[PDB]
Amino acid sequence: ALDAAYCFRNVQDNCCLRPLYIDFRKDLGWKWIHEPKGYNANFCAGACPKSPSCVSQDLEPLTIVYYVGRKPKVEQLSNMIVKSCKCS
Numbered sequence: 001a002l003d004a005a006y007c008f009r010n011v012q013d014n015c016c017l018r019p020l021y022i023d024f025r026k027d028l029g030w031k032w033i034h035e036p037k038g039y040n041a042n043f044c045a046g047a048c049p050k051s052p053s054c055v056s057q058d059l060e061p062l063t064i065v066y067y068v069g070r071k072p073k074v075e076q077l078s079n080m081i082v083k084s085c086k087c088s
């Protein structure tokens with residue numbers, strides 16, 4: 001698939017997964033997530049052979065930490081990480 005294993009290895013103008021690190025506090029303005037400080041969300045871009053767009057395919061969740069007062073709470077966020085792309 002058009003995932004990290006294939007794309008991050010060989011550069012190409014074609015549709016592929018692209019690295020992208022997001023800092024929750026600094027980029028999104030989020031004060032809610034205390035751990036991790038950020039994560040690799042990645043994204044999709046590139047030439048597609050109608051004329052498709054390079055878009056996400058499979059998504060993965062992210063486990064984070066938020067607070068109710070001072071108390072740490074664990075929670076799985078859905079659709080946070082892009083693991084593969086596709087032409088559609």
Ligand SMILES: [Ca+2]
Pocket residue numbers: 075076077078
């Ligand atoms: Ca959840």
